[PDB]
Design a protein around this ligand. Structure first.
Ligand SMILES: CN[C@@H]1CCc2c(ccc(O)c2O)[C@H]1O
Length: 284
């Protein structure tokens, strides 16, 4: 039987990867004064969200999957669900804020210096987490998301069962707040940035005539590891409520595909040469 020892190894490796990467990024930004920049506060917020997710959400879900029972109390089921939703929405919204910051950096270069002051770059982060917590903790803990049918009531009345059942309203509102609004903004921002880059290369070629792969590669790496990781989940999240069409195993698998996005963020964003120097100093 390889379906007990085997899936544990993969889950443990995911936990180790997430924890190691996020801890390294956080300590590199904290220890070195050169890396302290307005752009790097969004990165440290994202790293904090990913580290919390890797420490809390993944291990208990892994234990639940491997054991098929919930030994802990009934309070901890709702606490764990609330933490899961909070971390996911905070991470995605920080990803949106980073793209908006880059839009403001390239599109308007003269007014960028005054706009993103270090003092005003903290209110944005404090608002992101508050908005994340107003949709994660408050609706779940007040018991406003609860479903109404025999399976849901039986699940809620048992102390060893912890499965996600939700209404139509909460599912739709949660998906809209967490995914689609932060997606349209990123699409618009990155399209405009690509346009500006193309114009710049056109000017260079027209000027130094005698003597778009990079932009496409960078935008593909940024926007193909996010849509592919999170888009499949937020469609079944609506479908399984509108209509038996979606089975539970597919839902759980598509949920767990979106968790590994936390382990890839340091590769995508913490790739500058200064980060490489800082990582070299810390480890070796
Ligand atoms: C238990 N897993 C949850 C279920 C629903 C949900 C998640 C993440 C973000 C949301 O906006 C959600 O509505 C998932 O992490």
């Amino acid at each position: 039987e390889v379906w007990v020892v085997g899936m544990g190894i993969v889950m443990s490796l995911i936990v180790l990867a997430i924890v190691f990467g996020n801890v390294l990024v956080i300590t590199a930004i904290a220890k070195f004064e050169r890396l302290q920049t307005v752009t790097n506060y969004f990165i440290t917020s994202l790293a904090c969200a990913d580290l919390v997710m890797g420490l809390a959400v993944v291990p208990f879900g892994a234990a639940h999957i491997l054991t098929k029972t919930w030994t802990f109390g009934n309070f901890w089921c709702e606490f764990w669900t609330s933490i899961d939703v909070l971390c996911v929405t905070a991470s995605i919204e920080t990803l949106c804020v980073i793209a908006v910051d880059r839009y403001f950096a390239i599109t308007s270069p003269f007014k960028y210096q005054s706009l993103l002051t270090k003092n005003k770059a903290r209110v944005i982060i404090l608002m992101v987490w508050i908005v994340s917590g107003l949709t994660s903790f408050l609706p779940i803990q007040m018991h406003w998301y609860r479903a109404t049918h025999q399976e849901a009531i039986n699940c809620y009345a048992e102390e060893t069962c912890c499965d996600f059942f939700t209404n139509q309203a909460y599912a739709i509102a949660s998906s809209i707040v967490s995914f689609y609004v932060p997606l349209v903004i990123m699409v618009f921002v990155y399209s405009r940035v690509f346009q500006e880059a193309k114009r710049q290369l056109q000017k260079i070629d027209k000027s130094e005539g005698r003597f778009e792969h990079k932009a496409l590669k960078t935008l593909g790496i940024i926007m193909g590891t996010f849509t592919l990781c999170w888009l499949p989940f937020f469609i079944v999240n609506i479908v399984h409520v509108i209509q038996n069409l979606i089975r539970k195993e597919v839902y759980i698998l598509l949920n767990w595909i979106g968790y590994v996005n936390s382990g890839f963020n340091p590769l995508i964003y913490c790739r500058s040469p200064d980060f490489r120097i800082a990582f070299q100093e810390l480890l070796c």
